[PDB]
A paper describes a structure:
Here we show that a rhoptry-resident kinase RON13 is a key virulence factor that plays a crucial role in host cell entry. Cryo-EM, kinase assays, phosphoproteomics and cellular analyses reveal that RON13 is a secretory pathway kinase of atypical structure that phosphorylates rhoptry proteins including the components of the RON complex. RON13 is a 153 kDa type II transmembrane protein with a putative serine/threonine kinase domain and a large luminal carboxy-terminal extension (CTE) with no identifiable structural motif. Ultimately, RON13 kinase activity controls host cell invasion by anchoring the moving junction at the parasite-host cell interface.
The canonical HRD catalytic triad of ePKs differs in RON13 with an HFD motif conserved among all the coccidian orthologues of RON13. In addition, ATP hydrolysis activity was detected. The catalytic activity was completely abolished by introducing a single amino acid change (D595A) in the catalytic HFD motif (rRON13dk), validating the importance of this conserved kinase motif for enzymatic activity. To gain insight into the function and regulation of RON13 kinase, its three-dimensional structure was resolved at 3.1 Å resolution by single-particle cryo-EM. The RON13 kinase domain is similar to ePKs, but contains an α-helical N-lobe insertion (NLI) present exclusively in RON13 coccidian orthologues. Unlike ROPKs that also reside in the rhoptries, RON13 lacks an α-helical N-terminal extension. The kinase C-lobe structure contains all the motifs required for ATP transfer to the substrate, as well as a ROPK-specific disulfide bond. The CTE is mainly composed of α-helices clamping the kinase domain C-lobe. Of note, the CTE is essential for RON13 folding and stability as neither expression of the kinase domain alone, nor proteolytic cleavage to separate the kinase domain from the CTE of rRON13 yielded a functional RON13 kinase. Cleaved rRON13 behaved exactly as WT rRON13 when analyzed by size-exclusion chromatography, further emphasizing the strong interaction between RON13 kinase domain and the CTE. Analysis of RON13 electrostatic potential highlighted a rather extended positively charged groove lying on one side of the kinase that may be involved in protein–protein interactions, but did not provide strong hints to the role the CTE plays. Of interest, three autophosphorylation sites were identified on RON13: Thr379 and Ser381 within the NLI in proximity to the ATP-binding site (N-lobe) and Thr703 closer to the activation loop (C-lobe).
Numbering used by the authors: 280 to 300, 307 to 784, 791 to 1186, 1201 to 1258, 1266 to 1310, 1319 to 1332, 1338 to 1349, 1356 to 1375
The structure:
Amino acid sequence: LSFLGDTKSASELNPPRLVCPPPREEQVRKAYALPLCELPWDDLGPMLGSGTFGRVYPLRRPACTEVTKGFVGRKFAVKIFWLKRKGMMNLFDTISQGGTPSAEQTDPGTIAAIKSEIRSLPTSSSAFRDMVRIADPTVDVEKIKGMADSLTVETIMKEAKTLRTVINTNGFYTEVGETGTIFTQMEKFVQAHRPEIWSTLSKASQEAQASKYAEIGLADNHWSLPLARVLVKDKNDVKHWALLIELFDGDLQPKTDKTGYSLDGWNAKSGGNVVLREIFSSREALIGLTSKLVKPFVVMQNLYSLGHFAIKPPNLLYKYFPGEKGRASRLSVAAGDFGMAGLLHGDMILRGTLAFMAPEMERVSGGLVAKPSYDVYALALTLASFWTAATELRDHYPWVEKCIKPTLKKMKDAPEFTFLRFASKTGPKLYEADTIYALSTCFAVGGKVEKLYHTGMPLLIRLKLSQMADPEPLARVSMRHARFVFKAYAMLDKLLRAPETREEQLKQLQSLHIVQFLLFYLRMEPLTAARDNTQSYRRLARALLDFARLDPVYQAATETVQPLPYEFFTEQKDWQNVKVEVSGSEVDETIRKLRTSLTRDRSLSEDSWADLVDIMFGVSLDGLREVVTRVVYSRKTFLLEEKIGNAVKEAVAATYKFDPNTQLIAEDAPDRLFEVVRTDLGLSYPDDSELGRFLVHRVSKSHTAWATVDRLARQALRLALRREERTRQVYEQLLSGEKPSSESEKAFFDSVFSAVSVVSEANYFGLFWDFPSAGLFGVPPEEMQAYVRKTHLAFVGKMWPVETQKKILEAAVRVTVRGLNASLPASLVDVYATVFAALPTKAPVSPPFLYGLEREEYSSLLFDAKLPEFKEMVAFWATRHELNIAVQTAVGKIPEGMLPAHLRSPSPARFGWPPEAVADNIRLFIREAKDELALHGPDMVHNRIRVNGRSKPFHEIFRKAIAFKKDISVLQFNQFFTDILKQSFDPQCRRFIAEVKKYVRVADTEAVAPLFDILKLVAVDPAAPNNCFLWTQAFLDDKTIVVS
């Protein structure tokens, strides 16, 4: 362990730790000495982007001969400084060009803005008195700070030509100071940590000295800084100031849709999305981007002292280089905007964007000093915004519309999530008690943001992003640690995936520090170049997840703290003034044990131990005294997490004992499980205490795990049915109703259990339950293989094919539309929302999952459809049945310009049809309603009949319409429903009789018409309460049953 004592002091491959904690004119005069160039308004092309301070222009007819020697490739673009605020530049233009402006644009707001902006002109500086002298040598800037306030500004009709230059040059001056404050800090670093460069800059340079910094910032560090000081000459001889920035494709933030027909908000025709949609949809490109995106900020924080305090998707710039033939697509990323950058541990000003502000900046932090932990939060949010983008892109971020705001609305009179309430000094805080818990839950495994992630995001990245966005300022990992783990995983994944460059890849891998410690800790050898190292990459990537689960700390705490006997949680009163407290003197014995276990009985110094814990766990030395306290608190309450984990997994078995065909378990707890568990254990905890919240937190955490086990067992079945035709034979045997031999069932279940491991491998490097987990599940991992094979594979054995899943869902969506009489909205998002929120109550069969708590795995498993395709599948069914219902009533009124107000000429994109199918589907609906009407007559009689329906933990009564003749008898009445039972979905009820009872059954000689209302229709078996009339397509449909 010789590399730990700060061996690489200024390297950019693995920077050192963050150990511990100028005039104004100097910073402006530093960056003001950049090369100047002049070009007219003819090399500039069409405008390409516009902000609040400037407009960017690409330059045609190449110019700026300072470039020909400069950076190869790397197209350029100027930006003219043009203040956009209350249309005052437009007013200045209309006055200068000629004519008189309107009095409507002038009076209150424009004059207010000019009055506010002519003051605060830094007329003291000597740089601002030369910037204005170069652009216009006739204006005397010392009279304009006086004329604005002596006589109020209404001389605007004669001072426009000067006000323009003054204001735009003040904008240029601010943007120049923003870069000077960085050139200063870069020079302060090149002195101490670069001997080769500072032997040719310190000798003699002032402009080359300031161009070298820009070259270093663009090429080495991946920032984006200005390179020249171009001065543009207009057609009317009015010079504007500008800067020569680099040109990217830019703005990793995609555009949203506005027509309302896209079920993921992606604008289908934005032109700039076509490439972004290729990045945010694949797994390899996203794994590469995640590691490429941390480099600039790691460099910025650990090498130089400054920090970047406005991180958000619009501020990151990209460059694609498609690489179609003979090469590969190489993505490049840079950091854009440097408006708020400042030295670390210096005083700061609260100015950011609200959705990305750390919660510890809310009231105060010693006057809000600039801490390094404010930047790790904003990258966790930014990266989570990239992994959930191809699934439900919205205009507002997920953690504020699903996690923060519905919590803020409940337990306070403060629904205002604004910046004025965030910055204010007086009032109720914004992140006080429950909003912090909601934010913590939002990113953990099972929350909303975590429900929206890609299917292919490994568990290591999920855990790391969950640890970077931690509301607690301590116990939050640093940027160096994140860079290490993400880069190591990207390298290992590219080695594993790919089938002369292997040598360079292996050297670049083993040159890291995290990998060298992992090789020392796993007892491994310097790997190879001529050996198949597959199982040695499998171990380095699996040992990198055990440190995210925090397994070494748990193994060190298992040997120190005892488990707090079970007679503590049942034999104590006053449950509001007791709480499991950690001694504070054992959180030190566990740390000593951990140090000895990790170092392997060598003797490190203190700096080496600090560096090692920062590399491996990513915290300070007084920052692991909270990680360790969490672990030993979780170890004290053993024997209560285990009893809870065992109380559930019997609810999961009762679910299959009561409803023997469910098709999912649906991770979110059914809100009734808590009362089952609290009564199962015999507990009585006041719901507002350290133990009531603990119990409600553990019940859901165990239910999510058991639902995950169920889902993996259901995916393995569908994977093993795709191969091994013998498995398919036995599966069809099971489904058809009969039963197979014993050895055939054994082979079937053995194949499914062998496929469980193939399914579990991708996201969890190994099995799902293959870690120390006996408080999460109720079963130690040694007895977990023998539970899934013998017990759980019998629940999920007979699972309906996909066509049946789609048919019953279609028929349950076409009943909700009859149930609710109102019409449907205009945008398909709202149609889906209403139809799928009113579905559990008005449908006979309950859906497998609820609205808002839906996932991509559920849909891809049950329906073979992604989430934005599942929603689009539901909306079309809804709208088409709406059109059918509208045509039926109109055909009824006629003894057709009498359709409702928004169906006379609808766009065939509201349906799924092409433009040629609507005028035929209407004719089909007409030809069908004609028969539905011809049904009615004097002889026929219509009524409803009662059967058993949904199974609530006895059954509901469910009544279905019937139409028959008066001549019919019970003889011919029972035979029809017997023949209907033959096509049931439930394989058990394919052999039943379907008598009609009153429960005294009726004589077969009686008539049916005089009996019609207490009689019900039951299914009895001829050999020996069931609801297996509900599982038929005749009883699930809308049309009435025609008994005939």
